[PDB]
């Protein structure tokens, strides 16, 4: 039996949502930030952002909206989690005492219905008549906002349009009205429906259905006096309001997809737009006053303001200050001003907030000492791409201005090997050109192998993090895997790269290479090349041999005295062998769709033996070997699981048993290794969260499990979500309670509760016994 302990070393740093309103008081202007499970509450003060309280919800925040129904002196908060936990929250302060009251709560999941492509959409009617939710295709869920009733009886309305792109409630409507963009075989269209609470149905919308651009992706509900809706596409921005129709096709927006918006003025005169390149635009709605006192929209205009971090969300604060919520790079506070600077930009960065996400790869090293470990990650994407050096947390940032993909440390060379990718565009003359300088184009020296992605192997100095050398791979060649190792009887240490040939004509790679490089005298020399018939997804040094996965085959190569790779054996029983980990002669294979399998290299046979497989349809993201008998897996539904060899018949031994299950709530990209607990496995995630997994004895697990049940009776949950429900292994197929896993964050929270509450937790052991237990557990990270 396997007992594991999971604890947070670094909380998620990526921002997935940001809203402004009057939540803490009617007078305070607040900024609320959602960082997956974390909710940060700030007061916009004279100093600039005063933190008031940070709360961790037992769920992944999917919807976060402030709203003010009748009779409320301040805004209330609506939150919907990824597990469909709905709640309405009220902030209450009494002197020095702060409490978040759950006004209403319940789970709004449907047993039927398939989760939508553009995901969960949660919208609130401007008159606060109802909450609208797009959770599944073909259904529109409505939560009536009635205060004089014991239960908020939610209902589903059938939506004929099965593929809705975006939806919003319209302003200035006598009857609550939704406006949505949808796709069908005839293209994309904009449609409206009135929502009847009385009949529990849709009524014909105020304006006729209209055809829109093929890539129309977002709806903006314009406030009164204008009313109507703005639809953002790839090449056009249109306005719709009954008879009124305005359309602009500015060439300035064509290059990159606009992915976020925020209203600057309460009357909707100005909006901020953010694109995939990090460009910031101002959308201007030019008005005209009518003699009947009504204001009509005369024209639309777009102006480029400058560049910010690639924005997931934007929020205008006060006095030209904008918060840039980033998921791919660092978040910011930017200042908007009328006079352009030296480059001609109208945007000036005021503050930068560290974001480690996405952590695509990482490695643990002893750079400065001998016994002290530092974490070096491949962080961010595109222009935000960086290396982050983390130690006990102190964070050092190395900007790359391109996407880092893989990292390996080479001690003998006092350097790191980093695989990276940069975007190049097809121009008028010659081949393709880089749009911005980056690490691969700014190296001390460079070599070449003997919109599009240009791949490189970067040699970065372990002390200064200077780009010493950049080796560019072949045209259309994508570098997928990297290792730094010695092979066979050869005393040299090599950087080994696994690649794939990616063409704009085919879907799957049928060609690639394994390239052996040696770094010497500030340059990379190609020692050997080995042609393969597919993508080299993963490579691991294996007992002086090279283990590699090519499409659906796991292969073992031997390194000869003639400096050549020679195929020894193959394993073909895979769909896509994406992940490889080894311990002794054992190999853990992570499949993209078939969970995990265990192989054993047989030295006396010169072949592999398939030991056992986990017969579960897990879509893997990362794998790790905890010990000889325990295998850790992370999958697409944000869950962790532990597999164990079934402890009479060969068929019984050939079946791996899932003995540990836990809903992490994060997407794990990498696991790396680096008396109360045993072992230490660090993990990097898409949200920049860093966690730790360690093993426990049976007695330690039993005490800590009892402790969780005792703590759960004392610690109240915001939105009244049960801790056990949150940590329950959950997929579209099944929901099972967590087993063999202790929530380290929950047990650590014991040191934060008052002494009178500690005695009630430890009742029928002393408070001091458990204080000593929890304190030694905090020292593991």
């Amino acid at each position: 039996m396997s007992y594991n302990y999971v604890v947070t070393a670094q909380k998620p740093t990526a921002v997935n949502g940001c809203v402004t309103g009057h939540f803490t008081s009617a007078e305070d202007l607040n900024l609320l930030i959602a960082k997956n499970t974390r909710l940060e509450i700030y007061v916009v003060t004279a100093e600039g952002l005063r933190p008031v309280k940070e709360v961790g919800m037992y769920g992944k925040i999917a919807v976060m909206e402030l709203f003010r129904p009748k009779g409320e002196s301040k805004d209330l908060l609506f939150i919907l989690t990824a597990k469909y936990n709905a709640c309405i929250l009220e902030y209450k302060q009494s002197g020095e005492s702060i409490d978040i009251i759950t006004r209403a709560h319940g789970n709004v999941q449907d047993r039927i219905g398939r989760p939508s492509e553009t995901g969960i959409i949660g919208i609130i009617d401007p008159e606060c008549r109802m909450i609208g939710l797009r959770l599944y295709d073909g259904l529109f869920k409505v939560i009536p906002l009635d205060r004089d009733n014991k239960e908020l009886k939610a209902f589903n309305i059938r939506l004929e349009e099965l593929h809705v792109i975006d939806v919003k409630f319209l302003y200035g409507c006598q009857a609550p009205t939704i406006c949505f963009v949808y796709q069908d075989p005839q293209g994309r269209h904009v449609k409206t429906y009135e929502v009847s609470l009385r009949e529990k149905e849709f009524n014909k919308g105020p304006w006729k259905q209209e055809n829109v651009e093929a890539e129309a992706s977002m709806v903006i509900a314009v406030p009164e006096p204008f009313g109507g809706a703005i639809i953002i596409g790839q090449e056009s921005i249109t306005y719709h309001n009954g008879d009124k129709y305005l359309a602009i096709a500015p060439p300035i927006i064509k290059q990159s997809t606009i992915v976020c918006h925020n209203r600057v003025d309460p009357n909707g005169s100005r909006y901020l737009l953010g694109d995939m390149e990090g460009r910031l635009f101002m959308l201007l709605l030019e008005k005209e006053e009518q003699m009947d006192g009504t204001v009509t929209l005369k024209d639309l205009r777009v102006e480029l303001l400058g560049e910010t971090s690639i924005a997931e969300c934007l929020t205008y604060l006060d006095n030209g200050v904008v918060f840039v919520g980033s998921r791919l790079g660092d978040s910011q506070l930017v200042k908007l001003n009328v006079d352009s600077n030296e480059q001609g930009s109208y945007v000036v960065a005021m503050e930068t907030f560290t974001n480690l996400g996405p952590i695509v790869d990482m490695c643990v090293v002893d750079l400065e000492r001998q016994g002290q470990g530092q974490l070096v990650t491949c962080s961010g994407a595109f222009k935000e791409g960086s290396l982050r050096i983390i130690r006990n947390l102190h964070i050092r940032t190395v900007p790359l201005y391109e996407s880092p993909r893989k990292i390996c440390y080479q001690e003998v060379s006092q350097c790191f090997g980093v695989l990276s990718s940069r975007i190049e565009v097809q121009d008028t003359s010659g081949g393709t050109t880089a749009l911005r300088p980056s690490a691969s184009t700014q190296a001390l020296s460079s070599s070449v192998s003997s919109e599009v992605e240009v791949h490189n192997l970067l040699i970065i100095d372990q002390h200064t993090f200077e780009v010493l050398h950049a080796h560019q791979f072949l045209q259309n060649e994508y570098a997928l895997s990297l290792v730094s190792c010695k092979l066979g009887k050869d005393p040299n240490t090599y950087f080994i790269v696994g690649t794939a040939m990616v063409y704009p004509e085919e879907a799957e790679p049928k060609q690639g290479r394994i390239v052996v490089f040696q770094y010497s005298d500030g340059k990379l020399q190609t020692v050997a090349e080995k042609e393969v018939k597919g993508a080299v997804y993963s490579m691991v040094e294996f007992n002086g041999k090279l283990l590699a996965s090519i499409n659906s085959t796991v292969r073992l190569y031997e390194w000869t005295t003639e400096k050549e790779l020679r195929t020894e054996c193959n394993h073909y029983n895979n769909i896509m062998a994406l992940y490889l980990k080894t311990k002794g002669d054992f190999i853990l294979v992570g499949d993209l769709m078939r969970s995990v399998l265990l192989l054993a290299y047989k030295p006396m046979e010169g072949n592999f033996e398939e030991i056992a497989r986990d017969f579960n349809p897990n879509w893997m993201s990362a794998v790790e070997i905890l010990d000889d008998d325990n295998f850790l897996g992370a999958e697409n539904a944000f869950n962790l699981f532990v597999c164990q060899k079934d402890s009479t018949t060969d068929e019984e031994r050939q079946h791996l048993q899932e003995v540990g299950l836990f809903h992490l709530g994060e997407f794990v990209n990498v696991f790396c290794h680096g008396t109360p607990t045993q072992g230490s496995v660090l993990f990097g995630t898409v949200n920049g969260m860093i966690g730790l997994v360690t093993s426990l004895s049976e007695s330690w697990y039993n005490l800590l499990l009892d402790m969780q049940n005792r703590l759960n009776k004392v610690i109240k949950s915001v939105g009244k979500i049960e801790h056990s429900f949150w940590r329950s292994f959950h997929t579209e197929r099944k929901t099972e309670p967590a087993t063999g896993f202790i929530d380290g964050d929950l047990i650590e929270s014991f040191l934060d509760i008052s002494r009178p509450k500690m005695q009630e937790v430890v009742a029928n052991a002393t408070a001091d016994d458990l204080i000593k237990v929890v304190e030694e557990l905090t020292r593991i990270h």
Binding site: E117, L328, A507, E508, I575, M576, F615, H655, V686
Partner: protein, 208 residues
Amino acid sequence: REHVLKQLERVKISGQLSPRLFRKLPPRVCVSLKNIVDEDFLYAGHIFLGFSKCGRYVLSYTSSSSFYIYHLYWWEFNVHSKLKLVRQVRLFQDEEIYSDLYLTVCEWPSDASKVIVFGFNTRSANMMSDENHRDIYVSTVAVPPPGRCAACQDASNAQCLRHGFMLHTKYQVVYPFPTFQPAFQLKKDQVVLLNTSYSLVACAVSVH
């Protein structure tokens, strides 16, 4: 079309991995039936039906012989590896069928423990083909155990009731001949709804 590597790179930076994204790209593995079938079952003439809900098994039937005998098979699938026979059951026990049936093997939404076999003839017989009457044959068969089963281990191919039982039923239908509705008939996780022309029967089978 989107390249599989371009699709995989989206996953690493977005954390969004789901089959409803790989929906348009071609299959990852394609293996011919002749390369994974055991040569000893060549004279048998199996009629392969396809995969079970979980990609572990691949089902097939035999229409062996005025008097037809039907058999349901469970084969262990492991990509390029040869199929290994796990279960062989005799469909429609003590029932003599005079004509070749159009049989269909079904699976419940969340119940992986059992399967259903709906077999019907083009028109009933009474040697001579009898019109305005049709024979419907339905069998509820338990699937082999997924792992180690404590009750199965006790043996003197001995398998326990929970992971080794069978159910058989037969009814005559009149004009207009009822419509085959597998999706609705088995929408309830443990129930089979059967239209006997005269009545609709709710058939629930469960092992405790």
